[PDB]
Amino acid sequence: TDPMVTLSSILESIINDMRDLPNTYPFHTPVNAKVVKDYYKIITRPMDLQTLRENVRKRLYPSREEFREHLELIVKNSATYNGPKHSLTQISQSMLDLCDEKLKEKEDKLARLEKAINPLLDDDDQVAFSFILDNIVTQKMMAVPDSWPFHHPVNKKFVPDYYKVIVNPMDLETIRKNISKHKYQSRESFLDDVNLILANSVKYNGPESQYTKTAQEIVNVCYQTLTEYDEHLTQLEKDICTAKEAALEE
Numbered sequence: 001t002d003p004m005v006t007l008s009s010i011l012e013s014i015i016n017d018m019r020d021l022p023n024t025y026p027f028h029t030p031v032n033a034k035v036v037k038d039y040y041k042i043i044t045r046p047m048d049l050q051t052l053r054e055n056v057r058k059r060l061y062p063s064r065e066e067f068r069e070h071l072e073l074i075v076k077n078s079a080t081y082n083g084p085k086h087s088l089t090q091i092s093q094s095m096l097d098l099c100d101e102k103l104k105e106k107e108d109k110l111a112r113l114e115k116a117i118n119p120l121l122d123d124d125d126q127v128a129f130s131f132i133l134d135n136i137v138t139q140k141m142m143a144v145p146d147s148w149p150f151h152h153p154v155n156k157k158f159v160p161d162y163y164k165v166i167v168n169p170m171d172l173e174t175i176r177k178n179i180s181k182h183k184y185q186s187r188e189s190f191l192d193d194v195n196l197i198l199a200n201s202v203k204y205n206g207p208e209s210q211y212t213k214t215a216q217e218i219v220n221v222c223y224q225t226l227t228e229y230d231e232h233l234t235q236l237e238k239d240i241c242t243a244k245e246a247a248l249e250e
C-alpha cells in the first residue's frame, strides 16, 4: 500500500480523538472573522482541527513532525490571542498533549511509514534526481512562451476569486520548493503536481483561454524532457528505490 495513505489515516484518527476531548469546540473550525472581529488582525497563520483534517486529506504531512507543527499552531495562536495561561490555551494544550501521547503510543509503526514516505538523508541518487528535475522545470518548462502566469503562486490582489475556486493551487515555484526538499522519489510523484497546474487552469481559465493552451505546452515540454532523460531517470529511480527498500527491511 501507499504508506502515505496509511500515515494519513492514523493522523485523521488522532484528529477525531482531539475533536472529542471535552470543551475543545472553539478549535473545531476556523474562527469566524465576522464574529471575533479582531482575530485575523493578530493571528497571521490560523489553524483549526477542520483545516488540519483537510491538510491530511491533501497528503500534506509526510511525517509526525510536520503534522505536529501545524497542530502546535493551535496552541501558539491561542496563547498569543487569548493569553498564555488563559483557559482555552490550556484546552488547546490538552489536544497537543493527547496527540503527543498517541504519536509515541504508535511510535514504531509511524517511524516505518515515515521511512517509506520520505527521501533518504544524504542519498547521492536522490540529490542527483532532484537536481535533474529542477532543470527540466526551469530551463525547459519555464521557457515555454508566455508561461509566466504559472511561474509563481497567484497573487490574490490580481485574481481575487482564485483561492475560492481552486481547492489545490499549484505553480512551478512550489514544485521547485518540493524539489529542494527531495519530495519526489519517482517521476510519478513529480508529474502529478505538474498536471495539476493544467487541471487548475482548465478549472479556472477553461479551454476557452490561451493561458490554458500554454498550460498544456508546459505539460508537454515536461513529458518530452522526461523521456529524453528516461534511461538515466529509470536507473536513478531504481537506485533510490532499492536503497529505500533496504532501509525498510533493516
Ligand SMILES: C[C@H]1COCCN1c1cc(C2(S(=O)(=O)C3CC3)CC2)nc(-c2ccc(NC(=S)NCCO)cc2)n1
Pocket (backbone or CB within 6 Å): 148, 149, 150, 151, 152, 153, 154, 155, 156, 158, 159, 201, 204, 205, 211
Ligand atoms: C492566468 C491566471 C489564472 O490562473 C492561473 C494563474 N493566473 C495569474 C497568475 C499571475 C501571477 S501573479 O499573481 O503573482 C502577478 C505577477 C503579480 C502568478 C504570476 N497573474 C495573473 C494576472 C491576472 C490579471 C492581471 N490583470 C491586470 S494587471 N490588469 C490591469 C488593467 O488592465 C494581471 C495578472 N494571473
